[PDB]
């Protein structure tokens, strides 16, 4: 099995402008949305059919109640942060909790908070401490670190509970998550600015989005400038990416245990 991750995000918006919900919370397995909740619907709902099909109604019912409470928690915590900064108007508060199951079977866990889209607090599950960006974050760190048992519950959640949920979700969504769609790759040559020859190595139709793309010269790394395209969703569940260079050249593509070489 390749590397996989489970993530739950929260977004709290103070004094929201018409249309923006005061609270949104979304779950992901890899780059796939799995769950959604916001302060308008006030309901936790599936966002993947393999989530809807495999979890009993009691799951959505129970987490609807929990998220209504976590929404209230986020509202009050953002009020307290604004008061600590002497901020008025609309501000944002975010959280990301989650874990990864690496291909070697090892695991990672993370829990981070942000204020106005910037790092604010980062949990270290190995020392049970919170890393603060400024004096305001330091005030929150001192309060959160004072409750030893809550730190222990958090470590347990990231290392055991989160990984157990990820393994269940990975089995539920195996037909999409554990599949492989190999890349369609081609090299395109073109004379651009007078005297300049451009080489474009373009990949598309691949899944998972994790791909390695590099340009080699005579079998060694190209110390010249390389431009990279973003890994973009093509809308059909597959992705596209590219790498380009200028003027024996070869494009090397690694995807899901398969190496591919396109010699110019």
């Amino acid at each position, epitope marked *: 099995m390749r590397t996989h991750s489970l993530r739950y995000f929260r977004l709290g918006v103070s004094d929201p402008i018409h249309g923006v919900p005061e609270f949104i919370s979304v779950g992901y397995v890899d780059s796939h949305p799995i769950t959604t909740y916001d302060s308008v619907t006030r309901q936790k709902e599936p966002r993947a059919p393999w989530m809807a099909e495999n979890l009993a109604p009691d799951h959505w019912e129970r987490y609807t*109640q*929990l998220l209504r*409470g976590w929404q209230q*928690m986020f509202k009050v915590e953002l009020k307290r942060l604004q008061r600590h900064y002497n901020h008025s108007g609309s501000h944002t508060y975010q959280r990301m909790i989650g874990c990864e199951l690496l291909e070697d079977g090892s695991t990672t866990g993370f829990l981070q908070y942000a204020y106005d889209g910037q790092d604010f607090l980062i949990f270290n599950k190995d020392t049970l401490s919170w890393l603060a960006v400024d004096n305001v974050a330091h005030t929150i760190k001192q309060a959160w670190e004072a*409750n030893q*048992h*809550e730190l*222990l*519950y958090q470590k*347990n959640w990231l290392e055991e509970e989160c990984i157990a949920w990820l393994k269940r979700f990975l089995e539920y969504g195996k037909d999409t998550l554990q599949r492989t769609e190999p890349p369609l790759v081609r090299v395109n040559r073109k004379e651009t600015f007078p005297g300049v020859t451009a080489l474009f190595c373009k990949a598309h139709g691949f899944y998972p989005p994790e791909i390695y793309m590099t340009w080699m010269k005579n079998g060694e790394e190209i110390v010249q400038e390389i431009d990279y395209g973003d890994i973009l969703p093509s809308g059909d569940g597959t992705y596209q990416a590219w790498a380009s260079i200028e003027l024996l050249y070869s494009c090397h593509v690694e995807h899901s245990g398969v190496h591919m070489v396109l010699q110019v």
Partner: antibody
Amino acid sequence: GQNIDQPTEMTATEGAIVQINCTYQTSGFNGLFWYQQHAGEAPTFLSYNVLDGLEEKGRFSSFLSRSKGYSYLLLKELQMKDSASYLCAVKDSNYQLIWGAGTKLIIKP
Amino acid sequence: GVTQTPKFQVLKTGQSMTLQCAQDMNHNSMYWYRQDPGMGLRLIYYSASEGTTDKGEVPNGYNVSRLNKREFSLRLESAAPSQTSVYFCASSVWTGEGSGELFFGEGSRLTVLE
């Protein structure tokens, strides 16, 4: 979760020691709690464990084994005032409390 | 800091009753349990935060109202002899946090008779 087992009753002598066991089979685990409940009174929180180990609060020790799925509540230098019911409770994956039927502790003076 | 009333109450079958509960600890979550011989506590209804309530394990024959952050009342619509029990109101700072313990009220002894 589904099941929590703890003895119905335990008797031990004053000045001695008693270990109250609690085994659990749950749908996930977010911690185990011990509560003391004197006859006719409200339950009061004694302890919380979520990782492996033992913690001490006066004469009361609370241990947890994640691998074996059990906990014990250990009381040392037993006193008459320790006569009470001891409730074991586990929070499952969805933070729902699963309660044991309680252990009535009888102390022989 | 959990205040529960009444301590004792005799009811006739079909009669309606409200149990009051108030906490002054600034807790967000409130619960209603019933305790019966030879079994663990059983949740009737709970309220994870102000503005929401949901059924517990044994909700049939009851309803609740989270009136405000402080108060959570339990109602017996039409009392039945099976509803003879010891009722406990509880509160916690939040729900969905592992280490958070419960704070119990003094208990209400309800006896329902034909």
